[PDB]
Design a protein around this ligand. Structure first.
Ligand SMILES: Cc1cc(/C=C/C#N)cc(C)c1Nc1ccnc(Nc2ccc(C#N)cc2)n1
Lengths: 412, 547
DNA sequence: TTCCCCCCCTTCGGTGCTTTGCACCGAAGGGGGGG
């Protein structure tokens, strides 16, 4: 056989020259085993010292699967080939995927093994396996077939994927289809049993068409931008009204109609924090009006595809987190919270990894454009430990934050 | 027609450029006229062959034997991939029974160049003592002094050696400088057979490896270490004892101590490095203080007695222990068996202006974990001098996420504990101060004060201070004249960001005084309110400081 | 008189924010072990 699509970087830009982080001994043994197995089938080809490019490589696992899997950080090669996949062979993003009751995720990675990569491009997708203590030189390879985790791989394989999925789209026009990286999101309004049967039908259809394949449901109908609610107290003290005034001052930036001038009528003196204050009726009326404001939609909020989504994560203790996906500061496109799981005591970085995966999957479903994370964690700890509990086929873009968070205004 | 026993590696150039021309440079010392004779010998042995008028080249003679300088050409050569960038550390080396060194100096001229690229490495200079116009020249093998020659030679050597490494992995082969070191668990009775087989294998591919000197010479003195059969040390450390120390001398001493701190336990250089703050001239002599002299003598005390690390074993697991040293210094020992260390190290980086001890332990376990991953591949079992309850109380209430690998408590004081903890609820029976501090940018004058609920008021002036420091001093005033149980209200969240983190040491003495006061107290509660709203007594104290 | 890698400790500078100060951070020069 078939013609190879000419993939070229933008003029005036070089290729990826990123180094690779040291790996654990088992993540090197399994990596070598998998790479030799892929070498026996002509999927990767060893390269000589005339290829000055490199991309980082990690090893991960999958849920309910002891077998390891390889992963290549194409976060820079994706940026370099900005024009190719985005402009020439872009993928439309439906605006109705949100309304589906259930969304299931499937893997189409092995369908990418068939198409070989362009001859002129094979040098850019070069990676190396390191050695324990650097005693021996790292074993270098390059991709022969189309590579997983690269932006241009779906852009090139969409022509065949449309022919794969046309009969199912025609026979079942009540199911929406979306593709991002090697992930296929299928949206439907059916019930659990019918959805599972239809997913099995899709799996067997893909197997029959030629795909090699060796719960998992998400419900967008259970997602809602969380609103902020003012505290409710049977007994009101000076400390509580001070906290409420501070919270309303903080929230007045979000809502221009927030008023706190009547709240100061109860704090005209240097009263002690512990002592109680009876509540005046004007203050109660304004407090109820502010509560009513805190349910209205934010005025001036719109989604502009030109800019990039910015995510944030705040740890609220007890193994609980909050997040706010937004573009302009204090103008939240989406908010939410995340809680513990079946594990009694597992980890703190692992919970952050799961929260990041959930946030980015929801951002793909809602918008299709992955945000950038302001992760509240040490850079060294994250870089050292993220791979141990990360189960995904792609990597977001995160910048770490070193500021004092005084945000107790998200979880009570 | 030329010959080639191994595969050639294609090389390109940066597009749009051609071959340069270089001015004459002085020749070597041991040869001044023998260049033509050695060129004739090279042409006889096939490394060099004459050509026609290919393209304008002009290259000098380097200032051993003749060496052609391609420095101007090296700016036209394709970029290559460097093979070895991180040197192995001796601790992560397995214990070999015997070692043997072979010479591969001449084998560097036995890797054929690219047939398409041979026409670029051409020498175009005649003799010096005689009178000749000039002969032709081009390399049929890897040139010396080329940008890409070392990488190509290393790749070819690895390709040649890999078939032998496949059959018998027990023998390890390393290529440093221009030799080959072979280590094996076989005794000398059978080591020679393997050495002979390796030599025959290298000869089959066209390389001869004769060497006699270092086959019986351990230690090996490699990169600054003293590798023996089953131990390793550092090369001997020289400590200057000159009475007068300049800035450069202190820098040299602290660098040498940092290098020597990898095998000698309990080396502290934190006090010495402080002497270099604010001084940059090497001709300025900095007088020595008491703490610096004491720590310098302490460092000298370890180095007289020699100790040797042991070689790693992959059949066991490694344990890392951390000990405190005060002022923010930590020392760790990594060993696979007690009293037989694999490595030692120190950590003293001051990450941030305001930090405490538990955060330092968190930042110190990370370094050990990363170093173990780089060197040994497995994370070690930590044995920290901290209590699990303190760790939980700190990490469940801190905003930053963090993790520690499997670690066990060991009782060896000084233990690491959080000195003071605030209260989350207002105290019953505690006077509620309302503090404020104001400053002026023009007059550089400020006023810090507080008003209590009982009616007590206090204001103090300050000079050459900013608003943040005025507010911190107002909190200081609130803490000074108060009971054990204290409630405070401040309208600035910067002091809240400082105090709430609960630091143990700071680079500003005011915060140090604040912790010194908060240690004596029993229960402290700090609250934040927005200013400019006349909330509580904040308006009164704001008026007092502003008027 | 090179240049680069690795490591460490200050100094410096521009962001991010608590706002012409203050905190955090990376990268620049010096000091070590070699080519
Ligand atoms: C880094 C390294 C440096 C030299 C030395 C280079 C130089 N000069 C020699 C060898 C063979 C190696 N490579 C390896 C690999 C695995 N285990 C070991 N252990 C080991 C190291 C030194 C001695 C000795 N004597 C014995 C065993 N060395």
């Amino acid at each position: 056989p078939i013609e190879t699509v000419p993939v070229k970087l933008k003029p005036g830009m070089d290729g990826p020259k990123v180094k690779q982080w040291p790996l654990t001994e088992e993540k090197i043994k399994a990596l070598v085993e998998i790479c030799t197995e892929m070498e026996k089938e002509g999927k990767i080809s060893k390269i000589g010292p005339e290829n000055p490019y490199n991309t980082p490589v990690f090893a991960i696992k999958k849920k309910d699967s002891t077998k390891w899997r390889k992963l290549v950080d194409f976060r820079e090669l994706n940026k370099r080939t900005q024009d190719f996949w985005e402009v020439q062979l872009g993928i439309p993003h439906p605006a109705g995927l949100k309304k589906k009751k259930s969304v299931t995720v499937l893997d189409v990675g092995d369908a990418y093994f068939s198409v070989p990569l362009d001859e002129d491009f094979r040098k850019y997708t070069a990676f190396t396996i390191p050695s324990i203590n650097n005693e021996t030189p790292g074993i270098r390879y390059q991709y022969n077939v189309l590579p997983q985790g690269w932006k241009g791989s779906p852009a090139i394989f969409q022509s065949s994927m449309t022919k794969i999925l046309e009969p199912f789209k025609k026979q079942n026009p009540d199911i929406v289809i979306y593709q991002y990286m090697d992930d296929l999101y299928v949206g439907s309004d059916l019930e659990i049993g019918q959805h599972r049967t239809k997913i099995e039908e899709l799996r067997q259809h893909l197997l029959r068409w030629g795909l090699t394949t060796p719960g998992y449901e998400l419900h967008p109908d259970k997602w809602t931008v969380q609103p902020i609610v003012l505290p409710e107290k049977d007994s009101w003290t000076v400390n509580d009204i001070q906290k409420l005034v501070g919270k309303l001052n903080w929230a007045s930036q979000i809502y221009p109609g927030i008023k706190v001038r009547q709240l100061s009528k109860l704090l005209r003196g240097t009263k002690a924090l512990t002592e109680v204050i009876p509540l005046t009726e004007e203050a109660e009326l304004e407090l109820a009006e502010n509560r009513e404001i805190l349910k209205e939609p934010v005025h001036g909020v719109y989604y502009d595809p030109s800019k990039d989504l910015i995510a944030e994560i705040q740890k609220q203790g007890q193994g609980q987190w909050t997040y706010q996906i937004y573009q302009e500061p204090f103008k939240n496109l989406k908010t939410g919270k995340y809680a513990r799981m079946r594990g009694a005591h597992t980890n703190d970085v692992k919970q952050l990894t799961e929260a990041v995966q959930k946030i980015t999957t929801e951002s793909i479903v809602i918008w299709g454009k992955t945000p950038k994370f302001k992760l509240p964690i040490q850079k060294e700890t994250w870089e050292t430990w993220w791979t141990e509990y990360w189960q995904a086929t792609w990597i977001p873009e995160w910048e770490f934050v070193n500021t004092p968070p005084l945000v107790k205004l998200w979880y009570q | 027609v030329p010959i080639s026993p191994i595969e050639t590696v294609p090389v390109k150039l940066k597009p749009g450029m051609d071959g340069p021309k270089v001015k004459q440079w002085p020749l070597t010392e041991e040869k001044i006229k023998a260049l033509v004779e050695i060129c004739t010998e090279m042409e006889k042995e096939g490394k060099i062959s004459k050509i026609g008028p290919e393209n304008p080249y002009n290259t000098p003679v380097f200032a051993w034997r003749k060496l052609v300088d391609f420095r101007e050409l090296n700016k036209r050569t394709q970029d290559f991939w460097e093979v070895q960038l991180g040197i192995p550390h001796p601790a992560g080396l397995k214990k070999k029974k015997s070692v043997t060194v072979l010479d591969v100096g001449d084998a560097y001229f036995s890797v054929p160049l690219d047939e398409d690229f041979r026409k670029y490495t051409a020498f175009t200079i005649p003799s010096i003592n005689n009178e000749t116009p000039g002969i032709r020249y081009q390399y049929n093998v890897l040139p010396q002094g080329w940008k890409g020659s070392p990488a190509i030679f290393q790749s070819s050597m690895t390709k040649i050696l890999e078939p032998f490494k496949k059959q018998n992995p027990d023998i390890v082969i390393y290529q440093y400088m221009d030799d080959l070191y072979v280590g094996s668990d076989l005794e000398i009775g059978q080591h020679r057979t393997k050495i002979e087989e390796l030599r025959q294998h290298l000869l089959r591919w066209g390389l001869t490896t004769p060497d006699k000197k270092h086959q019986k010479e351990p230690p090996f003195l490699w990169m600054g270490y003293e590798l023996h059969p089953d131990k390793w040390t550092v090369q001997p450390i020289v400590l200057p004892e000159k009475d007068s120390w300049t800035v450069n001398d202190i820098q040299k001493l602290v660098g040498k101590l940092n290098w020597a701190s990898q095998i000698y336990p309990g080396i502290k250089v934190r006090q010495l490095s402080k002497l270099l703050r604010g001084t940059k001239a090497l001709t300025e002599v900095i007088p020595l203080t008491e703490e610096a002299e004491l720590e310098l003598a302490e460092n000298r005390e370890i180095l007289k007695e020699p100790v040797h690390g042991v070689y790693y074993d992959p059949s066991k697991d490694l344990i890392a222990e951390i000990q405190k040293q005060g002022q923010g210094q930590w020392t760790y020992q990594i060993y696979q068996e007690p009293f037989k260390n694999l490595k030692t190290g120190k950590y003293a980086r001051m990450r941030g202006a305001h930090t405490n001890d538990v955060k330092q332990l968190t930042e110190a376990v990370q370094k050990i974990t990363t170093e173990s991953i780089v060197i040994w591949g497995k994370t070690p079992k930590f044995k920290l001098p901290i209590q699990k309850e303190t760790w939980e109380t700190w990490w469940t209430e801190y905003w930053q996420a963090t993790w520690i690998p499997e670690w066990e408590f060991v009782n060896t004081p000084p233990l690491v504990k959080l000195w003071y903890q605030l209260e989350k609820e207002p105290i019953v029976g505690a006077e509620t101060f309302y503090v404020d501090g104001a400053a002026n940018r023009e007059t550089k004058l400020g006023k810090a004060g507080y008003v209590t609920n009982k009616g007590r008021q206090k204001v103090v002036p300050l000079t050459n201070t900013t608003n943040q420091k005025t507010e911190l001093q107002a909190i200081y005033l609130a803490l000074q004249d108060s009971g054990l149980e204290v409630n405070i209200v401040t309208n600035s969240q910067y002091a809240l960001g400082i105090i709430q983190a609960q630091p143990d040491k700071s680079e500003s003495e005011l915060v140090n005084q604040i912790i010194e006061q908060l240690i004596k107290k029993e229960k402290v509660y700090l609250a934040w309110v927005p200013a400019h709203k006349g909330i509580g007594g904040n308006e009164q104290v704001d008026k007092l400081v502003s008027a």
